[PDB]
Amino acid sequence: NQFNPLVYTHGGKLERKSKKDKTASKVFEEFGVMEAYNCWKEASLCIQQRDKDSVLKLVAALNTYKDAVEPIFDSRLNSAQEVLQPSILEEFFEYLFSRIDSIVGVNIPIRHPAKGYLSLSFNPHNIETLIQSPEYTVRAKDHDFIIGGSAKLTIQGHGGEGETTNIVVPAVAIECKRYLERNMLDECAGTAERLKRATPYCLYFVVAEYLKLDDGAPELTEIDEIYILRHQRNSERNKPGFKPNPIDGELIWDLYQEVMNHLGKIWWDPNSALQRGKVFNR
Amino acid sequence: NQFNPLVYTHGGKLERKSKKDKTASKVFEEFGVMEAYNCWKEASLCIQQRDKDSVLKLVAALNTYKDAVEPIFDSRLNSAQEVLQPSILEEFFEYLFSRIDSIVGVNIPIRHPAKGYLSLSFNPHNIETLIQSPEYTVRAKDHDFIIGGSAKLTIQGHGGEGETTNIVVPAVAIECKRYLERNMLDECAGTAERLKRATPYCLYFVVAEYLKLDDGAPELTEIDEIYILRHQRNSERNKPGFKPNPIDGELIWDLYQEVMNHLGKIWWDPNSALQRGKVFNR
């Protein structure tokens, strides 16, 4: 009865790039990225409770890690921008949610970036294959972080021989962005629509550090919540004297509490609806 | 090597209503509906080739049958309006397509009204069921006539025990209406969208006898074709001296040819696309 569902998305990317790119590899050793990373991981794994103080401590270790390596990524690895930096928040959510198993009372197989099921459609080759074994496509969207189940989907026609696809059915999906612009918000908007049709009980969050939007009015349809972890606008970053606010631990605490509440609930509970008088509660 | 895939949707409805409603039952005997029906069926089954002349003859038998029983339905059974009349065209398409098996070279299981697959979504009860055996819903739309395959869809979670649903995957879908108004056209419009997403190679037709639309500009998006079999507007029907044009056999011939052409084709054929230079041909 435990978990051991940690994948270390960011560590894996550091290892890849180290081998995939030697030049990166040189920078990582010279500027101590691998030891800063190992320290972040060790410190996170050492925080085992999930009361408010513990969560603030995880966020303090995250702030330290980003303060260490982000300046190296930004100034000494131009090519490795969205190759290494985005996976840091993803790995952070792997730590934050690594101890849900005993609380929720089940072993959750998916706690990492994954392709969340969106739809099934049939594209048979001809009439004979339509009858015998209809070809199909399962559509899925990459999300930066999913908590969810894995399932096998099988289709069989008259021929009787099945074709199976493995899918991921999210209970929570989180996108992680360094800043939130307009083209990416619209893309999340349209993804949230598809996701709530595929999986109406999936909570969908957008998490950003900085907000980079103009006058334009955004559409927040079906996105459950959007976080701006540093309470800063992205234009501040290039100004003389800029100093980044730290990622706000209070917001991570909020997010952690919202996720747990969602995981612990029966999502459609008719008798509860009737007793309450309202289908959705606080 | 044959077919025997006829279901007699309309005959079945006559039998139901006869037992479900005795009053109907009385009218059917008194006004000879059952013998007119048996004659239509016998005459249709006797036309076995599918050259143009044979198809015109099937349509002549259809015209005769409707000339016989529609006035009885309209004037002596108010309740049984869309209870018995709509199934006549459906049964007609059962006859027209009853001899496709040898041409297409496969036994097509579905040639009758059915629920055509639209989508699969997951609505798990709780986190434990999400992991172990995620509850799901398959959405489907009733169509007045489908030519297509039947398939079994299975979902399995960590528990390993599958849940199966039987579905219908249409290659052709036809809606049959006595007249085409605005609320029903819009409903078909929105269904065609869903259907082309679920099954992009399904041909979707709307077949009506009369057109009952005003100035309003209709949206014909993704509907492959709409037929007005009597080349009449629905307002003509209540005028003194009105006489209905017969259902036009030339239009049924067109429809028959379009369906067969579609059934005989490979729907996505890359090398054919490349050779032709255009993905869609005449």
Residue numbers in the entry:
A (entry chain A), B (entry chain A): 3 to 284
What do the study authors state?
Purified samples of wild-type BbvCI, containing a 1:1 ratio of R1 and R2 subunits yielded crystals under acidic conditions (pH 4.5) in the presence of an excess of duplex DNA oligo containing the target site, and 2 mM calcium chloride. The crystals of the native protein diffracted strongly to 2.1 Å resolution, and belong to space group C222, with three subunits (1 +1/2 dimers) in the asymmetric unit. We initially calculated MIR phases, built an initial structure, and conducted refinements using datasets corresponding to the latter (heavy-atom) space group, and then subsequently determined the final, higher resolution structure of the native (non-derivatized) protein in the original C222 space group via molecular replacement and phase extension. The resulting electron density maps clearly corresponded to two full-length protein chains, but no density corresponding to DNA was present. In contrast, modeling the electron density as a homodimer comprising two copies of the R2 subunit resulted in satisfactory values for Rwork and Rfree (0.189/0.249, respectively), excellent correlation of the model to experimental electron density, and significantly improved geometric quality. The dimensions of the homodimer are ∼100 Å × 50 Å × 50 Å. The molecule is saddle-shaped due to deep concave surfaces at the dimer interface, and there is no obvious region of contiguous positive surface charge that might accommodate a DNA duplex of seven or more base pairs. Within each R2 subunit, the PD-(D/E)XK catalytic site occurs in its customary position, at the termini of adjacent beta-strands in the core domain. However, the two sites in the protein dimer are located ∼45 Å apart from one another–too far away from each other to catalyze double-strand cleavage reactions producing a 3-base overhang.
